[PDB]
Amino acid sequence: ITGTSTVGVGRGVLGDQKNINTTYSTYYYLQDNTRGNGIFTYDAKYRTTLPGSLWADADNQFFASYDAPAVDAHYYAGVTYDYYKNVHNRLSYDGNNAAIRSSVHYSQGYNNAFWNGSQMVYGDGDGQTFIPLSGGIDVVAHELTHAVTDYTAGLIYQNESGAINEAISDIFGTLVEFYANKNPDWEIGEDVYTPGISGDSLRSMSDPAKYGDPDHYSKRYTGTQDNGGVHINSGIINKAAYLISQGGTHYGVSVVGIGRDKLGKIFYRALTQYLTPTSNFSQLRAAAVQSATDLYGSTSQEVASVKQAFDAVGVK
Ligand SMILES: N[C@@H](CCCC[NH3+])C(=O)O
Ligand SMILES: [Ar]
Ligand SMILES: [Ar]
Ligand SMILES: [Ar]
Ligand SMILES: [Ar]
Ligand SMILES: [Ar]
Ligand SMILES: [Ar]
Ligand SMILES: [Ar]
Ligand SMILES: [Ar]
Ligand SMILES: [Ar]
Ligand SMILES: [Ar]
Ligand SMILES: [Ar]
Ligand SMILES: [Ar]
Ligand SMILES: [Ar]
């Protein structure tokens, strides 16, 4: 809508209070004019028509329990925008300030979220397996990272290219969680998954095997489920990125960690400068080595750790 930029206040899925950028025009809308061409949050009203209605609120106060998923989708979209702009000098997902659109209250008891090619979509979960998915900053950032990938490398969502696509979303989702500095970790989805069980998550980057995912190329899934294992084989690459950042010894191969900033820089360069829609794991290694070489020089510790990490996970 056209209106004037306002600042509302509300409570997210995890019960924390935060301010959100809104727009006033009769009602207050979840329309943040402060970032690029705007961040817009919609209500899908438990249906699957998309995007649904731009979120309207009479008083600019968002403390209703129905409000919470909207608050977080909107607020964490804003955090993710800020991450990409400040850390990578990337303006929104297309690098030209495209509007970021999210819908919440998608369907009934929907245990997932996704990027649909145009916007983000968040289920409310069924209350057992998931609580509303936009509650997890890593989830929000994972989904929006898919938009970044679509605009850059364009990795096809199947087999090895699809597992890289997934890993990219887990890596940057995690890097956004660290950037925001609320209870950051190398796990995925821990804030919204199984409210009945503490300490668990959907996937682990530091130890993929925790959740049944492979941590070495030799253990790759080769069947047809899950588009050829895109959320399974991502563990191989997630492990490599974890090792590059944090370091460690994995099946006797030792990796000197170089830290998150350098991980982010190397992978962002690889994504934007080298990968292609059909890149496979070996091509990713080449891209990451070449990116590290570009940034730090062929004889650097950074290049050496990239090579060691891909060695440790069996990617030649
Ligand atoms: N986001 C992952 C895990 C969530 C599935 C559990 N309902 C996928 O789409 O496979
Ligand atoms: Ar909620
Ligand atoms: Ar805030
Ligand atoms: Ar604004
Ligand atoms: Ar934006
Ligand atoms: Ar901007
Ligand atoms: Ar509405
Ligand atoms: Ar309304
Ligand atoms: Ar309202
Ligand atoms: Ar409303
Ligand atoms: Ar973005
Ligand atoms: Ar990756
Ligand atoms: Ar949860
Ligand atoms: Ar694989």
Ligand SMILES: [Ar]
């Ligand atoms: Ar080891």
Ligand SMILES: [Ar]
């Ligand atoms: Ar080693």
Ligand SMILES: [Ar]
């Ligand atoms: Ar770090």
Ligand SMILES: [Ar]
């Ligand atoms: Ar990458």
Ligand SMILES: [Ar]
């Ligand atoms: Ar990225």
Ligand SMILES: [Ar]
């Ligand atoms: Ar391609």
Ligand SMILES: [Ar]
């Ligand atoms: Ar090394």
Ligand SMILES: [Ca+2]
């Ligand atoms: Ca209100």
Ligand SMILES: [Ca+2]
């Ligand atoms: Ca966390």
Ligand SMILES: [Ca+2]
């Ligand atoms: Ca996490």
Ligand SMILES: [Ca+2]
């Ligand atoms: Ca849990």
Ligand SMILES: [Cl-]
């Ligand atoms: Cl006005």
Ligand SMILES: [Cl-]
């Ligand atoms: Cl919260």
Ligand SMILES: [Cl-]
């Ligand atoms: Cl309420």
Ligand SMILES: [Cl-]
């Ligand atoms: Cl736009």
Ligand SMILES: [Cl-]
């Ligand atoms: Cl996904």
